[PDB]
């Protein structure tokens, strides 16, 4: 996360770290007591459940809970060349005991309204500037949804943002997800104080460039896939 702050314990109870060969690699979100929603490209080099561990807690050095992984499911039509359908599910070896500090985020409704300029929070242990290292302490940053068409401007991504994707950032830049934040959530609170995952951190041109906002998997576009795989 660029331009954000350290999250407090319990702020983001669905956030998890995914560790490959005992190092933080990607973020994810609990969507029930067995399942974590994340990005496909996290598993491009290794998709062996035995080599992955999930953790909960604001700290990756001193986690509150370590959880073994049993299954990794990559979207059937994930295409790395165009970043399309960059989405994955991870099923845990044992159910997680839900508490105030550790529990699930809501999936959005198929008709969820997500206006441009609307506020959202992105969370993770990613780098604090382009080319930096990951951090041990969870960070959060506040950003605004940017319309797909504006994001597709010739001076921006110029047609690369597709319908199952979404963009977010701030006009002057400096606030964004970075390398190490992939698979983490982009969340909005509704007026009943429930939080919904609208995006999954996916890709972008560097990090924090004003003309290049963060690109995220649009979760509404994958609801039917998720329900099939998980019953959620």
């Amino acid at each position: 996360i660029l331009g954000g702050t350290e999250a407090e314990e319990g702020s983001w109870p669905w956030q998890v770290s995914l560790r490959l060969n005992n190092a933080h690699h990607c973020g994810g979100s609990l969507i029930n007591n067995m399942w974590i929603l994340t990005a496909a490209h996290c598993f491009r080099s290794n998709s062996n459940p035995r080599d992955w561990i999930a953790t909960s807690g604001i700290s990756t050095t001193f986690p509150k809970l370590r959880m073994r992984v049993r299954n990794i499911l990559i979207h059937n039509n994930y295409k790395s060349a165009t970043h399309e359908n960059d989405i994955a599910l991870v099923r845990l070896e044992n159910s997680v005991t839900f508490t105030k500090d550790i529990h699930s985020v809501c999936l959005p409704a198929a008709t969820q309204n997500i206006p441009p300029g609307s506020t959202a929070y992105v969370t993770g242990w990613g780098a604090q500037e382009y080319a930096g290292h990951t951090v041990p302490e969870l960070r959060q940053g506040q950003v605004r949804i940017i319309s797909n068409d504006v994001c597709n401007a010739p001076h921006s991504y110029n047609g690369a943002i597709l319908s199952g994707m979404l963009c977010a950032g701030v006009p002057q830049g400096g606030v964004d997800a970075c390398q190490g934040d992939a698979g983490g959530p982009l969340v909005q609170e509704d007026s009943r104080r429930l939080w919904f995952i609208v995006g999954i951190v996916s890709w972008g041109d560097q990090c924090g460039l004003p003309d290049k906002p963060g690109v995220y998997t649009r979760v509404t576009a994958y609801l039917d896939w998720i329900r099939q795989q998980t019953g959620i």
């Binding site: 319990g10 702020s11 109870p13 969507i31 029930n32 007591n33 839900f98 508490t99 105030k100 529990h103 699930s104 985020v105 809501c106 999936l107 609170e189 509704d190 104080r193 429930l194 939080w195 919904f196």
Partner: peptide
């Protein structure tokens, strides 16, 4: 919280209050 979803800390503490 429980097998429900989306609850921040303030929502949980509220629901605990009698």
């Amino acid at each position: 919280l429980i097998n429900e979803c989306g609850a921040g800390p303030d929502l949980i503490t509220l629901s605990e209050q009698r």
